[PDB]
């Protein structure tokens, strides 16, 4: 749907909030071939393979130098990244895509709505409008639901989980060590402007099908695009205390879906 100015928009969060989430933390290894290179609350995952790397999400554009320094601090290089993956096309997940793609020469992979929004530099957002723009970037590979990419012995499969944005994409990964991982995009929806939203008429049914889609994924490792959605900070503290199984959470994804579903219900009631 095209943006209808007669449709009310949601208020945009203050930039100070995104900056607080973008506070840097030193990178660490979640498991073999999986490195966290993001910020205190904005996830970014580096999947390493013998044939090159895949980077999921990029954080704020202000954070692009820090993301690169994180990847390098972990001993890897931005020029070995083959694919850049996007969960949803807002400044806190795709702000640095324009400069990360330029610095790496990787292919950006995203769903068609995320590609359209990232090409607009974030504008025409169904809920935010042009409130939070970021450097525009072109997507090279449009990914489709249940479409897989193979690189260096891992498998990354896209799962369309719309609702937070029309193009919201989650990513299921099968690693070299046999373990499975999910990168769940946000399942959060805007207060009030949920029903009969002229900019996004399928929101209510989309998010409900996303609940089912993610609930069906039984994986070993639960990651999400926001740190406090998968207990990042307390798992990292457990990890640096000797628990290497800290990020192994076979039920975490199902719990996050139920928490998201409950919150969504209280919003429909209001």
């Amino acid at each position: 749907a095209a943006l209808d100015p007669s449709q009310p928009l949601s208020p945009a969060p203050p930039l100070s909030l995104f900056k607080a989430w973008a506070k840097p933390i030193k990178p660490f290894q979640i498991t073999e071939g999986v490195w966290y290179v993001g910020t205190k609350n904005l996830s970014s995952i580096l999947l390493t393979t013998p044939a090159g790397h895949i980077l999921i999400d990029a954080g704020l554009d202000e954070s692009a130098p820090q993301i690169k320094a994180n990847i390098e601090a972990a001993g890897f290089r931005l020029t070995d990244v083959r694919y850049l993956l996007n969960s949803h096309a807002r400044l806190d997940q795709a702000g640095g895509m324009a400069r990360l793609k330029a610095w790496s020469g990787a292919q950006l992979v995203a769903s068609q709505p995320n590609a359209d929004q990232m090409a607009r530099g974030g504008r025409q957002d169904f809920a935010l409008g042009d409130a939070l723009p970021f450097p525009p970037v072109t997507t090279d590979k449009i990914i489709h639901h249940q479409e897989s990419i193979i690189l260096g012995g891992i498998t990354v499969t896209a799962l369309f989980t719309p609702g937070h944005l029309p193009g919201s994409t989650s990513w299921r990964v099968t690693l070299r060590n046999g373990k499975t991982l999910i990168y769940a995009d946000s399942l959060a929806t805007p207060d009030y402007l949920l029903i009969n939203n002229k900019n996004y008429p399928d929101l209510v049914t989309d998010i409900q099908s996303s609940f089912k889609t993610l609930a069906a994924q039984h994986v070993d490792i639960f990651i999400a695009n926001k740190g406090d959605h998968f207990g990042l900070l307390e798992k990292r503290q457990q990890l640096r205390n000797g628990d290497t199984q800290a990020f192994f959470d076979s039920n975490g994804l199902q719990q996050y879906v139920e928490r998201s579903r409950q919150r969504f219900i209280t919003q429909l009631t209001a």
Side-chain angles (χ1 to χ4, degrees):
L3 201 79
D4 190 325
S6 68
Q7 166 72 35
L9 293 177
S10 288
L15 266 161
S16 69
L17 178 53
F18 297 101
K19 300 302 163 56
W21 293 344
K23 281 151 68 177
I25 60 178
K26 67 172 267 179
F28 61 94
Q29 176 179 250
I30 291 163
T31 184
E32 184 182 1
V34 184
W35 287 83
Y36 185 89
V37 290
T39 63
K40 216 186 192 174
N41 202 41
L42 303 179
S43 296
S44 182
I45 299 291
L46 184 74
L47 306 177
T48 61
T49 98
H53 313 321
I54 295 171
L55 188 65
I56 307 174
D57 286 350
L60 295 178
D61 185 56
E62 284 78 4
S63 290
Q66 180 62 34
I67 287 285
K68 167 178 159 291
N70 288 350
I71 293 167
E72 299 168 343
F76 309 98
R77 295 300 178 263
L78 187 50
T79 52
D80 293 337
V81 174
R82 307 252 314 113
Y83 298 100
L84 295 159
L85 270 41
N86 180 233
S87 53
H88 66 277
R90 289 186 172 161
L91 82 165
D92 46 357
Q93 318 287 146
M97 281 298 188
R99 293 202 292 174
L100 287 193
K101 176 179 166 178
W103 295 342
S104 67
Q107 290 180 282
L108 175 56
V109 182
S111 66
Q112 189 59 77
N114 281 333
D116 291 357
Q117 178 143 327
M118 281 188 301
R120 298 189 304 266
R123 307 163 202 280
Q124 311 299 97
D125 183 294
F126 88 95
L128 301 181
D130 300 10
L132 295 171
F134 60 84
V137 64
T138 306
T139 302
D140 304 283
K141 179 170 296 188
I142 301 303
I143 205 76
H144 305 84
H145 180 60
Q146 290 279 352
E147 178 175 3
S148 294
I149 301 181
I150 269 78
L151 187 64
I154 66 170
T155 298
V156 187
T157 307
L159 301 168
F160 278 9
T161 51
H164 184 74
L165 273 192
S168 287
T169 305
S170 295
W171 300 94
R172 181 189 173 105
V173 186
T174 296
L175 300 167
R176 313 241 306 157
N177 51 18
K179 300 293 146 53
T180 56
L181 177 153
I182 191 80
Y183 188 95
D185 193 17
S186 167
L187 291 170
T189 51
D191 296 315
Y192 308 118
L193 304 179
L194 232 33
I195 26 257
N196 314 127
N197 190 310
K198 307 178 194 168
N199 299 340
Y200 188 3
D202 293 323
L203 197 165
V204 171
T205 51
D206 274 3
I207 191 74
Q208 286 175 77
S209 291
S210 303
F211 295 155
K212 292 220 190 81
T213 294
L214 285 175
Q217 309 300 319
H218 303 291
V219 301
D220 304 317
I221 294 161
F222 171 48
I223 311 292
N225 77 291
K226 288 287 190 310
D228 60 58
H229 292 180
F230 69 104
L232 163 78
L233 295 186
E234 62 253 43
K235 284 177 182 174
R236 164 172 166 265
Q237 202 242 13
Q238 292 175 29
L239 181 63
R240 256 166 96 176
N241 277 338
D243 187 328
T244 48
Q245 306 306 105
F247 286 96
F248 287 71
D249 188 5
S250 64
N251 215 263
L253 174 60
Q254 279 63 34
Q255 296 171 3
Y256 167 65
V257 169
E258 259 300 311
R259 292 193 310 263
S260 304
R261 189 177 101 90
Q262 294 292 332
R263 175 172 308 184
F264 168 73
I265 290 173
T266 65
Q267 286 176 326
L268 290 178
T269 309

